[PDB]
């Protein structure tokens, strides 16, 4: 944990923070001695006072500027030391990142690289900004407030230090349990709730049976459980931390008890009491305030490792070293000799097994061969990207690796299959091939590619702004632009892979134009798969299994009859905000909360009523008549301090109560509610990339918690918060009158400083966020596309551009941390300074008998300690920003009325059903891509007992179709019915019943095979006999049997209990179970064996008379058994007809049966 190294000018800066901070710490308990001996000499009192409280008022007035200098200085210091730290280490990290060499980056992750080049950085930032700082600060209080007491005086001091620290990390220490336990119970939620994942994730064949009834009925029986649960643990807890409460309320009221009795026998001044006292809590509390920065930090030094990590790893091949021999004299001529290597990404498999390759200068040498036989990787390799694993490979007579690699880099060039170009002008990302570019060259080679009239049509010539992952050009623009930059460089080895990929017949020929009229400057190597190309390859070498056999030129290898030849012969062939109805919608437990009202009015009014209760004591101390009874009424004062705690306890508890069943039920409704319109809904909004699968459950889950917090924390914190402040104001003016004013002007501004101050520093991170995600997109683009950026040997430049990108960011720190410096040690300065003047106003209205001293100690710590009670307690509360805009989200779900009204009874339900189909002129595009039309009015016309099929080009419209048949998606415009009836106009849920689909990737209820199979149908009970029956036509009537348990064995998930064909099977035996009188199968064969699938087949065909049958698969056999057959081409119905028919008229389906003619 020593990860701070400094620039020894920056050091000094941490250095004087941590003094100042120190030193700040160690100012409020001066400031209670301060307060303590002032209330001593009034003691005495009880005109010289005037004097002496002015005294006092200069002593507070001179700490207060101390403390203000020092607050500044170290909260200034800190913020400026970190941000100088984190600015170098992300200088020094992409420095890294783009120096590591290309084998380290391909084994690594890119995703989490550039996650962590940010968000690594911004944590490590938030751990060593100042929360360091606060650290030192709340040590240095703890430190001085125990010297303090300890100088002062030993018994009380100790006899506080023994009782008030202990009872409160017990406390702490139960609140973190209760944490703890909130989390497992959570958890515990979870797992009742994985019934709606597993329903949801699924939920494309749940909607298609319409069987949502019992997931809604199981998923209340898991959620009634989970309420059970919850109200128990928010009882316990709210119990343990009123528990907690009282006690240390009883622990300060025993330190009193035991001070009075003290000062009564007389050992120490009764201020003195008081100023000891209030040094030992505020250490304490102090010392309490101290976690979360070191929690903080730890995550910090975490992530500052994994940074350090990358940050420190020496690579292998220094590409930003200038280690190297740079000969000038270059002659094209490279010779690799048995050139093993093995990619690391996986040691296993050895791609280059050793081989033999010698080429002079402008020597055209092409690489001929399968995938894999060793050519992308010979490329890759050709550039030094990767190491060889063993081999000798030595250009113009020299080794590569002893050259430096940046000027063996710079002097090849290479087009990949699919080039990209830097998010810039087509001329920009030109001038990034050459440190040096000049405009007459750029278009010199823009002619020379043949890139001049593409340039040139285009808006902005040469300016055009290349779309974020060059979307705006097309690919052969891409291709074209790329071969230009290359050329750019002007190398002395050039290397082409897959050149023709991408490229058009018109395309391929000019780039192979372009590199024939300047192949002669310099050694070219190609690989690419059209042969053409290949034909007037000068050398041709034929890499076979990682060796190469063929070699000679193209004439002699085809005579040889050889790989070339065999190839050749190949070749030859936003969310709307909603105010307040959440209130509409709490308001059905209306009697559940009013109660928690009252709870809540009566604890507000306990903190002021404690806070008169010590006013009181202490006054006991403010009469010359010094009488016995005095103790005694002390100690009566005391008696009633220990009631105030008892009086809160049972209170507290009453909240939890009150709030926390309404809050836990209210979720439970909610979760009821949401989740009845999530199963309701139609699949294109589960389609909709805002949210599909995990995305809907996680809502649901945070969201119980939000809503539960908005409705019920929000109110409780509300109204307790008012009523203390109400009351405390109400017993200054009783006790009242003059200074009464002056506190409630002067509190309330300290209040507004600090949230004013909590509220810039929240604007300022995101500020700076965004002013940082700049040039954090800016280095995603470079990270990218890593490969090319290596390539082209120019990460100075890109590091150039990040540092230049980040310059202004860092500046706008510095001067946000001075601001927040200024923001934060000014309120801590306006606080104090207003407690001296109130302190001074105070005396100067007693010194005139304006009031008792009694009254000023009850109205300053009334009104000082309402403020600090609800500025603690305002903390409790969940953030109402997230759950507001949780329940406005749920809102908005909830009401979201399907298109299809699955839940609304209106339909018609025909009592008979016949089984014909007839859609006309119906034409659909999916809502996903509505630009995309995939259906045009198409036609189909089926009657009753027709097995249909349909065919044609993978995803050419077999597919939308069945899901046309199940109302899935209805259609823009046209017309369908089912047996003469409107689709539309027919109920969805009789429909639903009366067909049956079987899906292509087959879905399992993930229970019993029995309960799975009966979840065929809905509200019917299916005997085991007719289990037995399904799967023996599902030929799984052994697998039925064996099924440990006969019907019981539970599946895994994704099936994974079964095999796929078995699996398949059982879904359609689940399908055939119900009895549905049409059948459509989509791609049913997708996996299946000859005895499976025969089995399959047959049963249906057997048992499709009485019913309709839908087949989508490519078993040309199968259709041939099948009544009717349909091609659909491109969304239209072309070729339809019976086999023979189809087979008499030669087309598209005569090509594709023949595609299998032997």
């Known amino acids: 944990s020593m990860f701070r190294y400094s620039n020894w000018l920056d050091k000094l800066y941490m250095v004087v923070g941590t003094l100042a901070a120190i030193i700040h710490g160690a100012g409020l308990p001066l400031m209670m001695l301060v307060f303590g001996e002032m209330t001593d000499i009034f003691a005495n009192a009880g005109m010289n006072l005037e004097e002496d409280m002015t005294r006092y008022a200069y002593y507070y007035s001179g700490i207060g500027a101390g403390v203000l200098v020092a607050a500044y200085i170290q909260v200034s210091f800190w913020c400026l030391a970190a941000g100088r730290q984190i600015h170098k280490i992300r200088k020094q990290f992409f420095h890294a990142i783009m120096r590591q060499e290309i084998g380290w980056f391909d084994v690594h992750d890119v995703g989490e690289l550039n996650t962590r080049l940010t968000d690594d950085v911004s944590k490590i930032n938030e751990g060593i900004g100042d929360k360091i700082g606060m650290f030192f600060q709340s040590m240095a209080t703890f430190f001085t407030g125990f010297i303090v007491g300890f100088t002062r005086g030993w018994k009380l001091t100790l006899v506080i230090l023994a009782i008030s620290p202990v009872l409160g990390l017990s406390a702490a220490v139960w609140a973190k349990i209760l944490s703890s336990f909130t989390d497992k119970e959570l958890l515990a939620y979870a797992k009742a709730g994985a019934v709606a994942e597993e329903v949801l994730?699924?939920?494309?064949?749940?909607?298609?049976?319409?069987?949502?009834?019992?997931?809604?009925?199981?998923?209340?029986?898991?959620?009634?459980?989970?309420?059970r649960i919850g109200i128990k643990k928010a009882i316990t807890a709210n119990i343990s931390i009123g528990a907690a409460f009282l006690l240390i309320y009883a622990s300060y009221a025993l330190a009193f008890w035991y001070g009075t009795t003290l000062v009564l026998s007389?050992?120490?001044?009764?201020?003195?009491?008081?100023?000891?006292?209030?040094?030992?809590?505020?250490?304490?509390?102090?010392?309490?305030?101290?976690?979360?920065?070191?929690?903080?930090?730890?995550?910090?030094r975490g992530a500052a490792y994994e940074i350090f990590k990358i940050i420190d790893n020496k690579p292998s091949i220094d590409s930003y070293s200038k280690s190297g021999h740079k000969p000038d004299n270059i002659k094209g001529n490279l010779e690799f000799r048995n050139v093993h290597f093995s990619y690391p990404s996986r040691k296993e498999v050895k791609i280059l097994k050793g081989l033999n390759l010698k080429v002079q200068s402008g020597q055209t040498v092409a690489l001929v061969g399968n995938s894999g036989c060793g050519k992308s990787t010979t490329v890759q390799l050709m550039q030094r990207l990767y190491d060889p694993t063993e081999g000798m490979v030595s250009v113009d007579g020299q080794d590569i690796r002893t050259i430096n690699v940046r000027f063996l880099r710079e002097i090849i060039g290479v087009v990949s299959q699919e080039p990209v170009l830097f998010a810039t002008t087509i001329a920009e990302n030109i001038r990034y091939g050459r440190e040096n570019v000049t405009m007459d060259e750029i278009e010199k080679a823009v002619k020379e590619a043949n890139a001049y009239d593409f340039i040139m049509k285009l808006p902005h010539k040469f300016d055009t702004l290349v779309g974020e992952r060059g979307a705006q050009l097309s690919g052969g623009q891409k291709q074209r632009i790329a071969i230009a930059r290359a050329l750019v460089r002007n190398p002395k080895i050039l290397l082409l892979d897959e050149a023709t990929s991408a490229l058009d017949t018109e395309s391929e020929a000019v780039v192979q134009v372009a590199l024939d009229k300047a192949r002669k400057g310099r050694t070219t190597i190609v690989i690419a798969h059209r042969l053409s190309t290949v034909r007037n390859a000068d050398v041709i070498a034929g890499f076979d299994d990682g060796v190469i056999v063929e070699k000679g030129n193209h004439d002699e290898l085809m005579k040889e009859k050889g790989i070339y030849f065999k190839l050749v012969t190949m070749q030859t062939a936003i969310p709307p905000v909603s105010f307040w109805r959440i209130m509409k919608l709490n308001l059905t437990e209306w009697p559940y909360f009013v109660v928690g009202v009252f709870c809540a009015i009566i604890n507000g009014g306990l903190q002021p009523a404690f806070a008169i209760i010590f006013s009181k004591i202490i006054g006991v101390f403010t009469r010359i008549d010094d009488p016995e009874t005095k103790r005694q009424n002390s100690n009566l004062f005391s008696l009633l301090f220990l009631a105030l705690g008892i009086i809160s306890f049972i209170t507290f508890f009453l909240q939890g109560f009150t709030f926390g069943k309404a809050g836990e039920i209210l979720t439970k409704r909610l979760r009821y509610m949401v989740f009845r319109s999530m199963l309701r809904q139609d699949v294109s909004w589960f389609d909709d990339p805002k949210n599909t699968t995990g995305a809907l459950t996680t809502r649901l889950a945070n969201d119980a918690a939000q809503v539960k917090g908005a409705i019920g924390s929000r109110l409780a914190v509300i109204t307790q918060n008012i009523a203390n402040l109400g009351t405390g104001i109400i017993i200054s003016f009783i006790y009242g009158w003059q200074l009464t004013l002056l506190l409630l002007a002067i509190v309330p501004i300290i209040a507004i400083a600090g949230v004013v101050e909590m509220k810039m520093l929240s604007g300022q991170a995101l500020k700076d966020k965004k002013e940082l995600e700049g040039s954090g997109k800016i280095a995603t683009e470079a990270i990218e596309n890593f490969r090319t950026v290596v390539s082209l040997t120019q990460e100075q430049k890109f590091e150039h551009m990040y540092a230049q990108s980040l310059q202004v960011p860092y500046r706008n720190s510095l001067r946000k941390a001075h601001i927040f410096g200024i923001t934060f040690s000014f309120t801590q300065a306006m606080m104090y300074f207003s407690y001296a003047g109130c302190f001074r106003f105070g005396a100067y209205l007693v010194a005139h008998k304006l009031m008792s001293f009694e009254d000023v100690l009850l109205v300053f710590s009334a009104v000082v300690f309402g403020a600090m009670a609800v500025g603690q307690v305002s903390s409790f509360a969940p953030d109402y920003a997230k759950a507001k805009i949780s329940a406005a989200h749920i809102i908005m779900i909830i009401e979201k009325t399907p298109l299809i009204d699955s839940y609304s009874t209106e339909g018609l339900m025909p009592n008979t059903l016949e089984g014909n189909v007839t859609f006309g002129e119906v034409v659909f595009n999916y809502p996903t891509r509505p630009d995309i039309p995939v259906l045009q009015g198409l036609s189909l016309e089926v009657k009753k007992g027709q097995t249909l099929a349909l065919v044609g080009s993978s995803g050419c419209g077999k597919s939308t179709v069945v899901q046309l048949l199940e109302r899935f998606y209805?259609?823009?415009?046209?017309?369908?019915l089912l047996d003469g009836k409107e689709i539309k106009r027919l109920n969805v849920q009789w429909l639903r019943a009366h067909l049956g689909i079987v899906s292509q990737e087959p879905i399992l209820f993930d229970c019993s095979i029995a309960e799975n199979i009966a979840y065929g149908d809905n509200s019917r009970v299916v005997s085991q006999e007719e289990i037995v029956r399904a799967?023996?036509?599902?030929?799984?009537?052994?697998?039925?049997?064996?099924?440990?348990?006969?019907?019981?064995?539970?599946?895994?998930?994704?099936?994974?209990?079964?095999?796929?064909?078995?699996?398949?099977?059982?879904?359609?035996?689940?399908?055939?179970?119900?009895?549905?009188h049409i059948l459509l199968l989509d791609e049913a064969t997708s996996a299946l064996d000859t005895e499976s699938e025969k089995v399959v087949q047959e049963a249906l065909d057997k048992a499709r008379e009485g019913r309709?049958?839908?087949?989508?698969?490519?078993?040309?056999?199968?259709?041939?058994?099948?009544?009717?057959?349909?091609?659909?081409?491109?969304?239209?119905?072309?070729?339809?007809?019976?086999?023979?028919?189809?087979?008499?008229?030669?087309?598209?389906?005569f090509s594709m049966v023949s595609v299998q003619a032997g």
């Not at 006292?277 to 250490?283: A, C, D, E, Q, R």
């Not at 209805?970 to 369908?976: E, F, M, N, R, W």
């Not at 199968?1118 to 009717?1124: E, K, M, R």
């Open 201 to 227: 994730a699924a939920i494309r064949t749940v909607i298609a049976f319409g069987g949502q009834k019992k997931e809604l009925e199981r998923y209340n029986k898991n959620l009634e459980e989970a309420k």
């Open 266 to 300: 007389g050992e120490y001044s009764i201020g003195q009491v008081l100023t000891v006292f209030f040094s030992v809590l505020i250490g304490a509390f102090s010392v309490g305030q101290a976690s979360p920065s070191i929690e903080a930090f730890a995550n910090a």
């Open 1108 to 1149: 309709t049958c839908i087949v989508i698969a490519h078993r040309l056999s199968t259709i041939q058994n099948a009544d009717l057959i349909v091609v659909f081409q491109n969304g239209r119905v072309k070729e339809h007809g019976t086999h023979q028919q189809l087979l008499a008229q030669k087309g598209i389906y």
């Open 1031 to 1076: 799967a023996k036509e599902a030929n799984i009537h052994a697998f039925i049997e064996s099924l440990p348990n006969k019907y019981s064995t539970k599946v895994g998930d994704k099936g994974t209990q079964l095999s796929g064909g078995q699996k398949q099977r059982i879904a359609i035996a689940r399908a055939l179970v119900r009895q549905p």
């Open 970 to 976: 209805d259609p823009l415009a046209g017309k369908v």
